[PDB]
Structure formats: structure tokens, C-alpha cells
Design a protein around this ligand. Sequence first.
Ligand SMILES: [N+]
Ligand SMILES: [N+]
Lengths: 66, 66
Amino acid sequence: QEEKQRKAEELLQELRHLKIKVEELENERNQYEWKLKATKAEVAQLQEQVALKDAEIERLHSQLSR
Amino acid sequence: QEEKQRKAEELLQELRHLKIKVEELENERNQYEWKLKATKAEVAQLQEQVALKDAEIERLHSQLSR
Ligand SMILES: [N+]
Ligand SMILES: [N+]
């Protein structure tokens, strides 16, 4: 039952490694959440550019039709 | 040293739980990677709409200036 002890120490090692993995995987999640946010800000700016250009096309069409 | 045994079983329980957490955190990562992809496809379609509207404004400006 040094091998009870040995299996114990094997399991601790494994716990340590899994705990580092969980810690890292929760870092990757946090930064995916902020890049998604950033990409969504890019969508919103583009929607804003489309609507400005639609306004400019409408203005030109009023003139064009006089 | 039933308590060697008892601490062993405590550690297995913990390993099981951490292994489920890692499994789930790697599910959340996979689906963040695909939502980011999807959001990026939305950006690309919008860039395409902007450029179509810029082409239409240019066409109108040529006419307007005749
Ligand atoms: N728009
Ligand atoms: N453009």
C-alpha cells in the first residue's frame, strides 16, 4: 500500500493538470466573448454606413427626378 | 488508512467533476468559434452592401453632373 500512496500521488498530478486546463479554457472563453463583442461592433458600424448611403441615394433620387 | 482509501475516493470524484467541466468548456469554445464565424459572415455581407451602394451613388453622381 505504498501503491495506495502511489495511486494517490498520480491522481493529484492529474488534478493539477486538469485544473490548469480548466483555468486556460475559461481564459479562452473570456476572450472569445470580447472578440465576439468587437465583431458585433463592426457589424453595427457597417449597418450605420449602409443607412447613411441609403439616405444619400434617396437624396440623389429626389434631385434626379426634378 | 481507510482514510488513504477515503482521500483516494475524494480525489476520483473531483477528477470526474473536473473532466465534465473541461468537456463542457471545450463545447462552449467550439460554438463560440462558429458564432464568431457567423458574425464575421454578417460583416462580409454588410461590406458587400456598402460597396453596392457606393457604386450606385457614383452612378447617380455621373448623371447628376451632366
Ligand atoms: N438602411
Ligand atoms: N465601398
